Ligand binder design. Structure first.
Ligand SMILES: Nc1ccn([C@H]2C[C@H](O)[C@@H](COP(=O)(O)OP(=O)(O)OP(=O)(O)O)O2)c(=O)n1
Ligand SMILES: [Ca+2]
Ligand SMILES: [Ca+2]
Ligand SMILES: [Ca+2]
Ligand SMILES: [Ca+2]
Length: 903
DNA sequence: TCGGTAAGCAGTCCGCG
DNA sequence: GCGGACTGCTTAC
């Protein structure tokens, strides 16, 4: 098999590499790597090395990496460019693996673990590690086993062994319900003292050394705790055995009260699953506890236990250990669904970087572009300092706030990467400039054609048409990958709806789910077989289809993020190819494209509808247009349609057969105007929106920029079994809006869009009467708590103190003297509740860590003094008033002359 | 050697016989 | 008690 790396580190003048060899065995080597860098030399000498602009360079081969570094500094002091890859481990990887990496994941040791630490005096701080580690569960992906290290004797209590038999039982039968599919995979190891547990864990670690180390919050808790605990007991040298190269780096975090640490373990790639989740999931959660995310991702119940966690080991050691095991499994379950570890491996090996560098789009692209150019014997430019400069971005149309009955949307495929490829924007393809006219002059095609020789953007930049650029070349590769995966995702989504449609008439049979690949649209034969399946098999197929859809979502959306990341990278000062001329060539072209096509669509639709000067395009943002389809529907007349699906088909056909070719014609003309390399402005129909036929639903509404709702029947070729709400920007979409309020506002919207004013008024009235009966967490607001210290003045709010920080300070004073009340963590999220005047907390609001119940001592008072009136007004009524006034609708029946009767 | 912009809304401060 | 000029947070893209 072809060899591939696992980890790589630079340690002084040595590269330390863990790798898989040709026989599939894990090995480690130390290499005294001799790096090369480059300097410009005169033309009149035979070299094979050229910079990206075609200028000749001479190679400088160094005896060691220090020498190469020191030479860089001398060149800066002389004032001459030092070219080549300055991150030597990237050069080493590029030299060692000069081919496309084909890795075997079954050879990569992926470890996830979590520890328990009983603490009788508040949160057990990793920097101090003053309490015994009393449990560790460590799952190893090669053994496919959960290794459980359990402390029986502790200064905080002596306990009996954990029982696997009791663990497997239903919670309703006094067990812990450890999932049956992992019972046989547990290897249980009890210990009579902490020293023996830790030594054995260390010996175990040596035998089974993680390559990928993950888990929930491992970077900020488990790793530094294990490290500092071992250090305090045995010494730092022993603690360094957690590094296969015996090298660590300790970073102390600042704040003011309660410093933290991050430990870098050399030769290990730490991918904290919380960080993977935040980067790759595209959610913003009100809480990031494992309980909350697990419920969200897997629909599994919260792991219940009685009393404080500080007393869980002594009162119920059995459950304590079981919950430790289940928590490790939950992360594995989330990963089986989300596939972020797979993505990280995919992306890291593609780029030829340390696996943990997938967090950095800049490092990722630097390495991709470096490897690409090196293949051509080209030499990369030195990184340079730039002052941070703001620059212009996308165009967003101001919508007229209103209801909009029939809406069709259209969207440009992968816009910024497509602009890069169309225009041929790259550091080395810059051909020159032209004198810019006002943007509106290009949009209206009155400005002089920029060039008849070069490919242009309306920012004034010209690029070569007949030359490949490394940025377009490499961005096209990842785009093509993205396209493949999004195809699988959309197919799986279409397949899902087939199953949902078949679930309306399930068969009374004992059968099995069909063995199919959900990444491809079902054949007619499969659809016929599905129409004859039982509910049980249909439901199993739907789960499978949806899992396939999620897998494809992960793969496509993050490849999209990577390629869009390259366009933004050009505007980040730390990027080797930072260049506002290029960043701005992209965004300005985007602005022109949206507004050009707005004009062309208004022109086309007026023509075909036989009118003049009417505005069909009601809104647009960056690369999308929203077209009012009322007059298209009216020209045929509403009465002609048999049902909702009839007019949806009509609009779908109209869009594909008439609008799209006209849109294509328009963008082809734009491409000729800018004399671009390749026409890649592909704008396809996205949503078809409207009320159900014969209903009083309003179909849709906008309140302003980035704030709208639509009743959608078809999305990107997925005809929904049931209409789906597309809500952007409104409070229903915001993580700061209370849970029960998002639900209530969404139902208010569903009613407005599908049913009408009366239905809305009926629901509002019910919700208002029941508001005060909702659970307090479900109606609490949420906010991130940044810069808490700044506004803290002897425990009281300083000037300009934000509402949520004021709430934290109120909580801080309320839990003063308390031992085991959870502290608010800087940068994390809090629930927030308003408090009535006169309350014993002494201030207008309280805030506490999100995803948690508020501590039992003050919970009673919070419930008593909660200001329901303010809460209802601020979180529910005020946004609803925004939606309804925009929609020319009332959520409460207005007084009228009719009030004299009854009725 | 750590490494995108546009834009809406809640809230504080302050002006306001 | 409600605006305008800020900060802060959050979402659309
Ligand atoms: N997180 C994001 C989202 C968008 N944008 C920019 C780049 C996109 O090209 C453009 C349009 O956003 P879209 O959400 O429509 O995404 P794309 O057009 O790139 O992809 P597609 O429409 O094919 O899904 O806005 C960005 O820089 N970063
Ligand atoms: Ca725990
Ligand atoms: Ca798009
Ligand atoms: Ca059937
Ligand atoms: Ca879009």
């Amino acid at each position: 098999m072809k060899e591939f790396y696992l980890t790589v580190e630079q340690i002084g003048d040595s590269i330390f590499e863990r790798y898989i060899d040709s026989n599939g065995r894990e090995r480690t080597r130390e290499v005294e790597y001799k790096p090369s860098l480059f300097a410009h030399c005169p033309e009149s000498q035979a070299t094979k090395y050229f910079d990206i602009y075609g200028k000749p360079c001479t190679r400088k081969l160094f005896a060691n990496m220090r020498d190469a570094s020191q030479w860089i500094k001398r060149m800066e002091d002389i004032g001459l460019e030092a070219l080549g890859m300055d991150d030597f481990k990237l050069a080493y990887l590029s030299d060692t693996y000069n081919y496309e990496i084909k890795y075997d994941h079954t050879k990569i040791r992926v470890a996830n673990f979590d520890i328990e630490v009983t603490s009788p005096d508040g949160f057990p701080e990793p920097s101090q590690a003053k309490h015994p580690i009393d449990a560790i569960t460590h799952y190893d992906s090669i053994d496919d086993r959960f290794y459980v290290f359990d402390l029986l004797n502790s200064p905080y209590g002596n306990v009996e062994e954990w029982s696997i038999e009791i663990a497997a039982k239903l919670q309703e039968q006094g067990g812990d319900e450890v999932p049956s599919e992992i019972i046989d995979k547990i290897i249980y190891m009890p210990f009579d003292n902490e020293k023996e547990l830790l030594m054995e864990y260390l010996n175990f670690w040596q035998q089974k050394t993680p390559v990928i180390l993950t888990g929930w919050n491992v970077e900020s808790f488990a790793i530094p705790y294990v490290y500092n605990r071992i250090k305090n007991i045995f010494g730092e040298s022993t603690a360094k055995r957690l590094s296969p190269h015996r090298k660590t780096r300790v970073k102390v975090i600042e704040n003011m009260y309660g410093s933290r640490e991050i430990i870098t373990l050399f030769g290990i790639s730490v991918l904290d699953y919380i960080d993977l989740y935040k980067k790759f999931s595209f959610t913003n959660q009100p809480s990031y506890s494992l309980d909350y995310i697990s419920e969200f991702e897997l629909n599994v119940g919260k792991l219940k236990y009685d009393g404080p966690i500080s007393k869980l080991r002594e009162s119920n050691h059995q459950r304590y250990i079981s919950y430790n095991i289940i928590a490790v499994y939950r992360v594995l379950q989330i990963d089986a669904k989300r596939q972020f570890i797979n993505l990280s491996l995919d992306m890291g090996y593609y780029a030829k970087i340390q696996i943990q560098s997938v967090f950095s789009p800049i490092k990722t692209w630097d390495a991709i572009i470096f490897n690409s150019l090196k293949e051509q014997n080209k030499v990369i430019p030195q990184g340079r300092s730039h002052p941070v400069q703001p620059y212009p971005g996308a165009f967003v149309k101001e919508p007229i706030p209103n209801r909009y009955k029939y809406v069709m949307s259209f969207d440009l495929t992968s816009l910024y990467p497509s602009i890069i490829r169309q225009v041929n924007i790259s550091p080395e393809t810059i051909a020159g400039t032209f004198k810019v006219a006002p943007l509106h002059d290009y949009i209206n095609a009155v400005a002089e054609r920029p060039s008849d020789v070069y490919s242009c953007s309306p920012n004034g930049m010209m690029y070569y048409k007949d030359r490949d650029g490394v940025v377009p070349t490499e961005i096209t590769k990842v785009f093509n990958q993205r396209k493949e995966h999004k195809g699988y995702m959309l197919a799986a989504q279409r397949n899902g709806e087939i199953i949902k449609e078949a679930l309306h008439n399930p068969n009374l049979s004992v059968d099995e789910p069909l063995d199919v690949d959900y990444r491809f649209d079902f054949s007619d034969e499969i659809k016929e077989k599905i129409k004859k399946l039982s509910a049980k098999s249909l439901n199993e197929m739907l789960f499978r289809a949806q899992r396939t859809e999620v897998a494809g979502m992960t793969a496509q959306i993050n490849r999209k993020a990577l390629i869009n990341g390259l366009a933004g990278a050009l505007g980040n000062v730390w990027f080797r190819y930072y260049d506002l001329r290029n960043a701005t060539a992209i965004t300005t072209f985007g602005q022109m494209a949206l507004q050009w096509i707005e004009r062309k669509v208004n022109e086309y639709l007026n023509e075909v509808c036989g009118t003049e000067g009417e505005a069909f395009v009601l809104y647009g943002d960056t690369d999308s247009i929203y077209v009012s389809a009322d007059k298209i529907i009216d020209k045929v007349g509403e009465s002609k349609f048999r049902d909702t699906n009839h007019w949806v088909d009509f609009l779908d056909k109209f869009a594909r057969e008439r609008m799209e070719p006209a849109i294509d014609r328009g963008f082809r003309e734009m491409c000729e105007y800018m004399n671009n390399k390749q026409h890649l402005m592909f704008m396809d129909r996205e949503a078809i929106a409207g009320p159900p036929l014969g209903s009083k639903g309003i179909g849709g509404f906008w309140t302003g920029k980035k704030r709208y709702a639509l009743n959608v029947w078809d999305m990107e070729g997925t005809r929904y079994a049931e209409p789906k709400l597309k809500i952007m920007g409104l409070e229903t979409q915001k993580s700061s809006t209370p849970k029960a309020v998002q639900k209530a506002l969404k139902e208010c919207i569903r009613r407005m869009l599908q049913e009408g004013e009366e239905s809305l008024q009926e629901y509002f009235k019910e919700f208002e009467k029941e508001f005060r009966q909702l659970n307090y967490i479900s109606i609490a607001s949420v906010s991130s708590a940044n810069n808490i210290a700044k506004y803290d003045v002897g425990g009281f709010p300083g000037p300009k103190c934000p509402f949520h920080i004021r709430g934290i300070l109120t909580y801080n004073r309320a839990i003063k003297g308390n031992i085991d009340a959870p502290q608010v963590v800087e940068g994390e999220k809090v629930y927030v509740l308003p408090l009535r005047e006169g309350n014993p907390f002494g201030d207008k609001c309280i805030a506490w860590p999100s995803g948690t119940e508020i501590t039992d001592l003050i919970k009673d008072d919070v419930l008593h003094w909660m200001d329901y009136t303010v809460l209802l007004e601020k979180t529910f009524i005020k946004p609803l008033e925004g939606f309804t006034s925009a929609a020319k609708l009332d959520y409460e029946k207005k007084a009228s002359l009719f009030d004299m009767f009854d009725f």
